[PDB]
Amino acid sequence: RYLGPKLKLSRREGTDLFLKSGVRAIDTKCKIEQAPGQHGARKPRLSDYGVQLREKQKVRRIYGVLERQFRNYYKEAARLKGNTGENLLALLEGRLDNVVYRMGFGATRAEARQLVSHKAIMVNGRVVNIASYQVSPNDVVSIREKAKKQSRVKAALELAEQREKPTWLEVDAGKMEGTFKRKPERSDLSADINEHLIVELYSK
Amino acid sequence: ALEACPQKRGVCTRVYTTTPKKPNSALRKVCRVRLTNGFEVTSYIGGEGHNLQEHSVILIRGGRVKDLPGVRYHTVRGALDCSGVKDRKQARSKYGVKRPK
Amino acid sequence: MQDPIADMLTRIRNGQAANKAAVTMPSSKLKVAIANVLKEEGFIEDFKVEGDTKPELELTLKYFQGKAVVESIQRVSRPGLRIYKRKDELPKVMAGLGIAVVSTSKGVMTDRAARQAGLGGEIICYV
Amino acid sequence: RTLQGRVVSDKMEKSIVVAIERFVKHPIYGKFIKRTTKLHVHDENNECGIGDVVEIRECRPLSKTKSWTLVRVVEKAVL
Amino acid sequence: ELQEKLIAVNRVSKTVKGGRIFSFTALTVVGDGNGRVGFGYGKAREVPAAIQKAMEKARRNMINVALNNGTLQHPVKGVHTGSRVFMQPASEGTGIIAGGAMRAVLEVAGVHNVLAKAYGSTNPINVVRATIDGLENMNSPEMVAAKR
RNA sequence: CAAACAGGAUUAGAUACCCUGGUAGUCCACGCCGUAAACGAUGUCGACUUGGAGGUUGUGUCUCGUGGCUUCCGGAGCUAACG
RNA sequence: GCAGUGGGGAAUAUUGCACAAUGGGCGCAAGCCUGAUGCAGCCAUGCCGCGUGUAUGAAGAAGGCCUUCGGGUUGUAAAGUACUUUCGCGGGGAGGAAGGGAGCGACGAGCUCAUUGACGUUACCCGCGAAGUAGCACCGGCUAACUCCGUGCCAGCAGCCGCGGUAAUACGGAGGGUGCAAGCGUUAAUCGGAAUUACUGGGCGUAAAGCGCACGCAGGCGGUUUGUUAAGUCAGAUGUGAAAUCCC
């Protein structure tokens, strides 16, 4: 993936993306609310193409996925029936790395991607180490019995207590398990994204 | 290029200098080349200095030189006898210049 | 003539432009068959067989304020190049508002009438 | 196969050439095009004369050019 | 309430006895989204002055598009000057497929789905005029029935 | 009468315009060619679509109706504009 | 003919391993033959997967850069702390394959039992275990991404419009920035946009465009009513329309 200063992407996109300590008052977007560089001060001039570009940008940045797969997933959701916009988030939200993040096993999607690759996450018993894995409804995503001891997940799942989960999900802090109820709709997701803009950009 | 070939070798006939058109003034280095295609065309010699003699024999890339009407091809430096530009610290991709230590 | 159907169609098109009460057109079973859909659809008041010795078709045109009952009407299938459409090929004129008359084995019918019966044929004209 | 045509020549003996004509749509334009073909039909009885619109059916090759034979005459004459 | 959309703005220059006098033109589309549209095109020595003047003109000339389930009642082909515009109703989920000129006018119009295309001249000023004209000729079975 | 051309003038020069002569040609008979802003630069036939006015010609119940032909002004409509 | 050599070209590879498996020829059979093929090697030529680290870490080092020198910027970025730990090492070690023969039965049918493997000791599993390559192109507009210095229509740039004659974001360097990532650029070749041959989709008085006219052959086209045929046209059934591919 990208791999680099994420706290700068938040400034560029204008919106505050949750990469890590987005909760703390550190997240640069709290100090200086302007894009990185020596020109983040001067008044920017955006065009129609600019708004669509930066729009999909923040979208893809959130899930931290390559531009290829992101495009590929777009084509797919655009093929299937139903509003493309809705389906879009549905697929991206279906990614294993993403699910794990939503479940609380990982502090962020980046860390979640690592946990998956580290075989520290299982799906319906069998272990899956592919962040691009598409999680379907009724699938149980729990932590590895051997990984249940690592302090990292021990601290993550500990903070999970009392914390609510999305309607399309349901976790059990005790068993450190998780279940993918159904595909999240746009109403369930509260992303700073305008699906109507990202669909236009790919139109061309 | 005849056979729609990307490049085409040839032997220089004469390495003379030419002067730009109305708006420009200089001594651009060109050279008549007898490509294997059977054609004798003039090609430009990029770089600040070259080492092309009479029996140079160089590959042709293909590119028109706005200032020099007639020159529709460029010589590929770094190939055959055409030695790459010396001390080229910049775009080494062109002029064929190996990256200094 | 060369294409009687086109003639009749034109004689009504030019007649309505002048806002004529009635118009004559050489009789012919096919013509009458056509006039039948025009009256039922509401494009014309009706018609009647006239002529002392020569059979004619007195077409009683009708109009309304703003627009003319028959805004547009043209033959699409001509003798020079005939056109045939399948059950699914039947085009919808002005998304339903307007209609098209087709000539099938079941007989002369409109897009909806032909669509219902489940057959296609030669697209006589569009109205 | 049966083919209908005209007797454009009765010069040879026991042999009559029938000019069969057909109509086919152009593969590109689609408009009907006219095309004809001459077939040397057998007529042992030299019954058919020039101008006769006869029917032709496929039969055992009498000769290299003749592989058809007069079956029946449609009309009497049309020059 | 009413939402405005900036179609396009042109520099527009002209030679006059004394020099060059610049006047900016601006196409604005005003619409609530439930069936009302409004096109405005006013000029002014200043860009914002033209934009505002345009919006005022757009709201002064509005059309009541008879929307039906986020679509139109029937296909139409309006031909303004050298420009030509075509519109075709479509099922839900298709989205507003059309140029920026027509779309902007259709979005505010309340149209949720429609298939369109520009013919002949591509002039933005002539296409918007053709679009609005087409939105006027639009009739419903109720109107036609009550009309006949 | 007038290319070429013979002279006289004009002019910086005029192997032009102006002036004085002048051959072919221009005229007639026969033979030759096939071209042209050979232009309304918009071929023929039939049906349909307001009229007004002038003129040629036939007929009619002739201070007007009707048929054919030749112009102009013009409804609708057509044309980028002229029309 | 396979591999290979020399010559040609911008350019394209191991004169490798092996028959056990599958298939083929001959034979009653045993069995023999089989570089067909199954594999390995070389090359980012392409495609997909993976790693060069993870968490922490100053209202905020040094250095470089800018400055109304007040300060600002590169930056949590590095240093440093903790954690995991691709390579590598040790051990184990695969699927891909039954009969001939022998015993029972009439050495027949049938049943039972015994012996034997390239790629590999490779894949994969377990154990141990060190943070452990990144580059390339671009930043005037189309194209997303900026300043300082050098040079100075000189040197040079350039697909098109153009730029350079002492203040150049389009030349060269540097800082910074954007894109992409072991890939990144370049050159060559194919597709639509062109409704610019327009069947779907076009035009011809002046923008390109009616042939100078007539006569006339072939050909194309052809008025109203009735009947026969029904070739064209239309309809039902049936045969064909190989596999694969494409679509679900």
How does DSSP assign A119-142, residue by residue? Answer: T-EEESSSB---TT-BPPTT-BEE
Q: How far is the CA of B1 from the CAs of B33, B70, B74, in angstroms?
A: 12, 15, 12
Q: Does the beta-carbon distance from E93 to A199 stay under 8 Å?
A: no
CB A171 within 8 A of CB A129: no
The position carrying tokens 């049966």 is D2
Chains in contact with chain A (at least 3 beta-carbon pairs closer than 8 A): E
Provide the 8-state DSSP code for C94: G
Binding-face residues of E in 43-82 toward C, CB within 8 A: 73-75
Query: Is nucleic acid strand F under 7 Å from C14's C-beta?
Result: yes
Query: Strand G: which nucleotides have any atom within 7 A of a protein Cβ?
Result: 9-10, 48-51, 53-57, 59-60, 73-77, 84, 136-138, 143-146, 153-160, 162-164, 172-173, 175-181, 185-189, 195, 199, 219-225, 231-235, 248
Pairing between β-strand E83-88 and β-strand E76-78 as defined by DSSP bridges: antiparallel
Q: How far is the CA of A149 from the CAs of A125, A175, A176, in angstroms?
A: 18, 13, 11
Q: Does the beta-carbon distance from E141 to C97 stay under 8 Å?
A: yes
Provide the 8-state DSSP code for A194: -
CA gap A142, C41 in Å, rounded: 68
CA gap A92, A53 in Å, rounded: 18
**Stretch (H or E) spanning C32:** helix C29-41
Q: How far is the CA of E141 from the CAs of D1, E57, E68, in angstroms?
A: 58, 31, 11
* B35: its two tokens: 């490509």
CB A156 within 8 A of CB A112: no
Say how far C100 CA is from G114 C1', in Å: 88
Find, among A2, A3, A34, A4, the residue nearest to A16 by Cα: A34
Instruction: Find and give the residue nearest to G219, measured CA to C1'.
Output: D34
Find, among C69, E90, C67, the residue nearest to C59 by Cα: C69
Q: Resolution of the deposited coordinates, in angstroms?
A: 15.0
Residues 6+ apart with CB under 8 A from A11: A28, A29, A32, A33, A34, A35, A36, A40
Alpha helices by DSSP H, listed for chain A, are 9-13, 48-63, 67-79, 84-92, 96-103, 109-117, 151-160, 195-201
Ramachandran quadrant class, A46 (left: phi over 0; alpha: psi -120 to 50; beta: rest): beta
**Which amino acid appears at position A155 of this protein?**
A
List E44's β-bridge partners, or say none.
E24
CA angle D6, D10, D12 (to 5 degrees): 135
CB D18 within 8 A of CB D56: yes
Ramachandran quadrant class, E125 (left: phi over 0; alpha: psi -120 to 50; beta: rest): alpha
Q: How far is the CA of D67 from the CAs of A113, B12, B90, D42, E107, in angstroms?
A: 81, 72, 84, 8, 74
Say how far A127 CA is from G116 C1', in Å: 40
CA gap A94, D6 in Å, rounded: 78
List of chain E residues whose C-beta atoms are within 8 Å of the C-beta of residue A199: 95
Provide the 8-state DSSP code for A43: P
Closest nt to residue A72, judged CA to C1': G48
Q: How many residues does chain E have?
A: 148
Instruction: Find and give the residue nearest to G154, measured CA to C1'.
Output: B26
List E16's β-bridge partners, or say none.
E19
CB E41 within 8 A of CB E27: yes
